[PDB]
Write a structure and sequence with these properties.
The structure is a homodimer.
Chain A (H helix, E strand, L loop, with lengths): L5 E9 L2 E7 L8 E10 L4 H4 L19 H13 L8 E6 L4 E5 L6 E10 L2 H4 L5 E6 L14 E5 L3 E5 L10 E9 L5 E6 H7 L1 E4 L5 E11 L2 E5 L3 E5 L3
Antiparallel strand pairs in A: 1-2, 2-5, 3-4, 3-6, 6-7, 8-9, 9-12, 10-11, 10-13, 13-14, 13-15
Chain lengths: ~240, ~500
C-alpha cells in the first residue's frame, strides 16, 4: 500500500473555492496510479455563539544523531508482525494526473476538512493509502453580513426607543453581535448588543435617553469581522 | 490486580477490557492503531511502572474517558528516555487525566495531535522535572484551539501567570504551600511524606494510592526492611519469591538474583552470578566474560511573592572546562501602553479564514533563587555563562527570559470605606480610596448596586477615577439601595468592598 500523499496544502483564492496542493507519497511500493480527495463540512460553532461577546473578556497579554531509530522501532515491529518485506458527510473526488486540485461551490466562510489519499497500480485491489488531511475556511462574502434590509424604529416609554431591523439571512459564518452608534446632534453614544438579546427581542430597546432629536447607525460583527454600518436611523425624544 | 510483566494492546477496544481488574501494571504498556468498532472506563488503574505509548488512536476523543484516576507514572524504564509518548492522535481533543499528580522519571513527547487542545494549560513544572526535555510539536495550534478554564487556580507560567486546566471541566489541582513539598489529599490535608498524590487519609502510609520509594504489605516505606528486597524499583519482596520467578524462556533463562538488596533478572554490569546459578551476584575481577555558549534552557518561576526561582542548563559549547554562571537581573518598567486604554469600553473583534542591574555569581550548579523582589514586578533576566577563559576574552552573550513575581494576596483589595453623595436627577456620586500597592496596576472598577438586589453593574476606568475620584450613577429609581465595587488589577480582580448602603429619594 502506498504512503499517504505528501505535503498536502491548501488555500482559498475565491469565495466558493479552495485550492489544494500535495506531493507524491514517500513509498509507492509500486507504480503510482492516482489520489483520492475527500472533504467534509465542519459546523458553525454553536459552542462559540453561546458566548456573550458584549460581556467580559480576558486581557490580551500584550498590546552523532542516531535517533531515527525512533522510526526503526516501529518499522522493525511491523516487519516482524508481517513475515518479510514481501455533522456532515464526506464529499469525494479522485485525482487524475496532478498533485493539485481545486474544490468549488463550497459554503462561503465555512470550515472544511479535506482528506487526500494516494494510490499505486496495485491499490485497485489492495486499496489506496490512508489520507493526509487539513482544515481551511472559505472566503467570506464581503458585506454579505451587512444588514440585508432597512432599519425600522418605534418609540418606547421613559423616553426610550426600540430599534427593529432584520437579521442577515446568511452571515459570514455567524452573527456574533451588533453595534449601535447613536446620538442627538452627533453620534456620541455606542452600544454593544448581544445575539441573545436580538434573538429574544428581534432588536434592542435603548432606554432613558436624554431629550432631543437623535440619529443612529448600527453595525453587525460577523465571524469574518465587522459588517457595514446601517443606514442612519433618525429619532427624537420629546421634552414634554 | 498487579498485571504484567508487559502489555502490548492493539486493534480492538474489546481487548481493552483486560484492564477490568488491573490497578498497577508491571512493565510497559503499548496502545496502537485503535479505531472504534463505545464507552470503556478503567478507574482501577492508578500506577504504571515504565512508560505509556499511544499511537494512531483514531476514535478516541479524550483520555479522561478511560483513565481519570491514573495518578503516577514511575518511568523506572523509559522508551528512549521518554516515559510518555503521544503520537498522531488524530481525534484526541483534550488530555483529561485530571488526577495525574506526578511523573517521576522520564521526558515527555507530544506530537502530531493536530486536534489536541489543553496543550499549555498545564504547568508541566508542577508535574515533572526537566520540562526542558519535553517535545510538543505539530499539535493543534494553541492560538486557535483557544483553551478554556472554568469562569481553579493560576500560577507564574514562565513570564506569564495563567489559569491551569487539564480540560474545560478540570483544573490542574494541587496542594497549598502549607504542605510544602509534601503531597496532600483532596481537601488539602497533607499526605504522608512517603506518599504520592492524593491520600484517602492524611499522614498515613496505609492510605496511599502510590508510594514514592517502596511498597510493602500495603505500606509505603522509604526502604526495604532487612529480609525484604527491592523489586522493579517500587516494592519489596522476600528472598524466596524471586527464587520462584522464572525469566523469559531462553537458553540462558534462570531464576532471579539478589544484590544490594535488589532482586534482578540478571546481574548488573560489573557483577556476575555465582557459578551455582545462585541468588547473589559476584564482581568479576577481570573483565566479565562475554568562550562559552549562552546558557541553555533558561527557565524560572515564583514560589512566593518577593522571590523568584530560576533554573537552566549548561551552555552548548563549554570551549573548556566550565567554571560558573553569572546572572544579572533588572526591573522592567510596567508597559506605558497599558495606562492609556479604556478597557471598560475596548473589546476588539475576532477574525479568521529605568532600573539597576543586580549581579550575583553561581558556584557549581544550574539553579538559584532570587529574593527581596517586588511582589508583582516583571523582570528581564540576563544570564551569562563563563568558562575559565572568559576572564581574558570576556564572557558569553546572554540567554534570557522574562518572569513575574507571585502577586501579593489581597494587596489589591480596597483598603478603606466607600463614601456616597446625592446628585440631581436622582443621581448618586460614589467616591472611594484607591489601593495603595496594587499588584502592578488597577485597570478598572466594577460597581455592583441595586435597590432590593444588585442587578446593575458598571465599569469605571482608572482615568475616570483620577478625574472624579469616583463615578456618578444617574436617574436611579427611588428607594433604598446598596452597592459594592470591585477592582480589576493586573493580577486579576481584587476583593469586593464591604457593602455600601445608600438611598435615592424621588424628589
Amino acid at each position: 500500500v502506498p504512503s499517504i500523499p505528501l505535503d498536502v496544502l491548501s488555500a482559498s483564492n475565491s469565495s466558493s473555492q479552495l485550492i489544494v496542493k500535495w506531493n507524491p507519497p514517500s513509498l509507492p511500493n509500486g507504480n503510482l496510479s492516482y489520489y483520492i480527495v475527500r472533504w467534509q463540512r465542519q459546523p458553525q460553532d454553536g459552542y462559540l455563539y453561546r458566548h456573550n461577546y458584549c460581556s467580559k473578556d480576558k486581557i490580551p497579554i500584550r498590546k552523532e544523531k542516531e535517533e531515527a531509530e525512533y522510526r526503526k522501532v516501529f518499522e522493525n515491529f511491523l516487519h516482524n508482525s508481517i513475515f518479510v518485506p514481501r455533522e456532515y458527510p464526506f464529499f469525494e473526488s479522485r485525482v487524475d494526473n496532478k498533485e493539485r486540485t481545486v474544490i468549488s461551490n463550497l459554503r462561503p466562510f465555512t470550515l472544511y476538512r479535506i482528506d487526500i489519499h494516494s494510490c499505486n497500480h496495485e491499490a485497485e485491489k489492495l486499496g489506496c493509502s490512508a489520507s493526509n488531511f487539513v482544515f481551511a475556511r472559505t472566503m467570506p462574502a464581503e458585506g454579505a453580513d451587512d444588514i440585508p434590509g432597512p432599519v425600522t424604529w418605534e418609540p418606547r416609554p421613559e423616553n426610550s426607543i426600540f430599534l427593529k431591523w432584520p437579521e442577515p439571512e446568511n452571515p459570514n459564518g455567524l452573527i456574533l453581535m451588533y453595534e449601535i452608534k447613536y446620538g442627538s446632534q452627533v453620534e456620541d453614544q455606542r452600544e454593544c448588543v448581544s445575539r441573545q438579546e436580538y434573538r429574544k427581542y428581534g432588536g434592542a430597546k435603548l432606554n432613558r435617553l436624554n431629550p432631543g432629536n437623535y440619529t443612529a447607525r448600527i453595525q453587525a460583527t460577523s465571524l469574518s469581522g465587522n459588517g457595514s454600518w446601517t443606514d442612519p436611523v433618525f429619532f427624537y425624544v420629546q421634552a414634554k
